[PDB]
Design a protein around this nucleic acid. Structure first.
Length: 17
RNA sequence: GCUGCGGUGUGGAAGGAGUGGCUGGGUUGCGCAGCG
C-alpha cells in the first residue's frame, strides 16, 4: 500500500526501469 | 521513498525476471501488492 505516491521502480526484476 | 510479484499487455487463455531482451510489443512496456 504506497502512501507516498512517488511510484518507485519495482524491484523484483528489470520491470520497473 | 525502499522492496517484491510471469503477475498484466500492442502473445501472457504458455515460459522466464531479463538470470534472452537498451527495438520485439520495450533504455526491461503496464499494473498491482507489501513496509514507513
Amino acid at each position: 500500500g504506497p502512501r507516498r505516491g512517488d511510484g518507485r521502480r519495482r524491484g523484483g526484476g528489470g520491470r520497473g526501469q
